[PDB]
Amino acid sequence: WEIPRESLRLEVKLGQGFGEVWMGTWNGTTRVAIKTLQVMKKLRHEKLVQLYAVVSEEPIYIVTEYMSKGSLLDFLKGEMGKYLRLPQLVDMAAQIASGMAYVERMNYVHRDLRAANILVGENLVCKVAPIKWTAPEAALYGRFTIKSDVWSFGILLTELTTKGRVPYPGMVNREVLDQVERGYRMPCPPECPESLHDLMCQCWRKDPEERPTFEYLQAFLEDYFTSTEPQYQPGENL
Ligand SMILES: COc1ccc(-c2nn(C3CCC3)c3ncnc(N)c23)cc1OC
């Protein structure tokens, strides 16, 4: 996994803050993402951003596949938001579901699944790479599980369907926590089918063991326009 420092060229800054992320070149021939300051060495999946190489002595360098559109959150908010429509958004949701199903199967917990933590490439490829996105049992008692990730996935569906807005518009953290424990849940967002809001509701069940698996979510999302909304019609935004 270890590569020589002189094999890397750092071209453009992409982000900063703990360290930075650059776009660059590996071995003079490969566009890569470079980040400066073991799970990533074990995990492998087409919907998981792929580690390429490391420089493991301070100053440390992490080298992964390049994702050309930046974060899903940035992508949704930018020039592309205006044009995404439910079939695109449902498709991206399904890809992430697929990523998380691999994580499910491998026995890992992600713990911070949300749009800022997903990357987007060419051709709408999406890949896996604070109260408001967190399941109550996780936020309150540190019970982080795949089931709390499923909760976050529910919140990400709303980010997808509102094209990147903050969940719980106008409420502050303390307000979200209090309200959600009292049984509040986000209503159906404008022009988004009730059947998809119902999936969100399934992710936000109080009993973490009653929430759907990712394998279930992936299959539902892949099949959505044949099995669930065979008669869908694009509207003004979705
Ligand atoms: C855990 O390691 C990383 C996680 C995310 C990114 C990453 N971050 N970024 C941008 C910085 C804000 C999103 C990327 N852009 C394109 N491709 C990428 N792979 C990235 C880079 C990483 O290392 C190269």
Side-chain angles (χ1 to χ4, degrees), residues 14-15 21 33-35 40 49 62 64-67 70-71 119:
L14 299 175
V21 179
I34 313 181
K35 169 150 104 158
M40 278 199 101
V49 195
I62 294 104
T64 69
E65 95 198 76
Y66 183 66
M67 307 295 291
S71 75
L119 290 162

Side-chain angles (χ1 to χ4, degrees), residues 52-55 59-78 80-81 83-99:
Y52 287 173
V54 298
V55 184
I60 303 173
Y61 286 85
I62 294 104
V63 190
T64 69
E65 95 198 76
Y66 183 66
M67 307 295 291
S68 63
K69 306 295 179 200
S71 75
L72 174 56
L73 183 59
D74 302 340
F75 188 58
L76 290 189
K77 284 155 73 60
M80 280 304 288
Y83 306 93
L84 297 167
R85 218 102 297 189
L86 212 76
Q88 300 76 52
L89 295 171
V90 168
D91 187 72
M92 309 181 226
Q95 290 180 248
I96 294 155
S98 173

Side-chain angles (χ1 to χ4, degrees), residues 128-130 132-140:
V128 171
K132 285 185 186 205
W133 280 263
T134 300
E137 69 279 359
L140 287 168

Side-chain angles (χ1 to χ4, degrees), residues 81 83-130 132-180 183-190 192-193 195-206 208:
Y83 306 93
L84 297 167
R85 218 102 297 189
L86 212 76
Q88 300 76 52
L89 295 171
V90 168
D91 187 72
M92 309 181 226
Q95 290 180 248
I96 294 155
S98 173
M100 291 309 310
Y102 174 77
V103 165
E104 195 164 79
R105 246 175 286 150
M106 298 298 283
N107 262 347
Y108 281 81
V109 187
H110 182 104
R111 317 179 77 190
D112 192 16
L113 178 68
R114 55 181 155 121
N117 284 339
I118 306 294
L119 290 162
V120 179
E122 228 61 68
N123 220 260
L124 292 187
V125 177
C126 295
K127 293 181 193 199
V128 171
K132 285 185 186 205
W133 280 263
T134 300
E137 69 279 359
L140 287 168
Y141 312 118
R143 271 189 272 298
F144 287 86
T145 70
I146 203 61
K147 293 311 186 181
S148 45
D149 288 332
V150 167
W151 183 286
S152 310
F153 189 78
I155 306 297
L156 174 58
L157 286 175
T158 82
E159 294 181 287
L160 285 172
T161 56
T162 54
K163 285 151 183 204
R165 305 302 314 262
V166 177
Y168 303 101
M171 312 186 181
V172 288
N173 296 332
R174 203 102 256 178
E175 208 202 299
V176 168
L177 197 74
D178 297 356
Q179 291 296 297
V180 162
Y184 181 84
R185 300 293 191 276
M186 284 175 289
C188 193
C192 157
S195 68
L196 194 64
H197 183 241
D198 170 72
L199 193 70
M200 297 171 201
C201 286
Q202 283 160 71
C203 291
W204 305 327
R205 294 209 253 248
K206 196 194 173 52

